[PDB]
């Protein structure tokens, strides 16, 4: 689903830290 910036949001390239940042601090705090 999604599309519309999937191309640089949903693509799992190698988000090595980003999947971590997702758990750490995916909010402005």
How much beta, percentage-wise?
under 5%
- Note the run of SSEs as H and E: H
Radius of gyration (CA) equals 11 Å
Name the helicity range. Answer: 10-25%
Instruction: List how many beta strands DSSP finds.
Output: 0
Q: Give me the secondary-structure category.
A: mainly alpha
Indicate how many domains the architecture comprises. 1
Compute the number of helices: 1
Q: How would a textbook summarize the main sheet?
A: none
Cα end-to-end separation: 29 Å
Outline? flat
Oligomer: monomer
Organism: Hepacivirus hominis
Subcellular location: Host cytoplasm; Host endoplasmic reticulum membrane; Host lipid droplet; Host mitochondrion membrane
Protein name: Genome polyprotein
Family: Belongs to the hepacivirus polyprotein family.
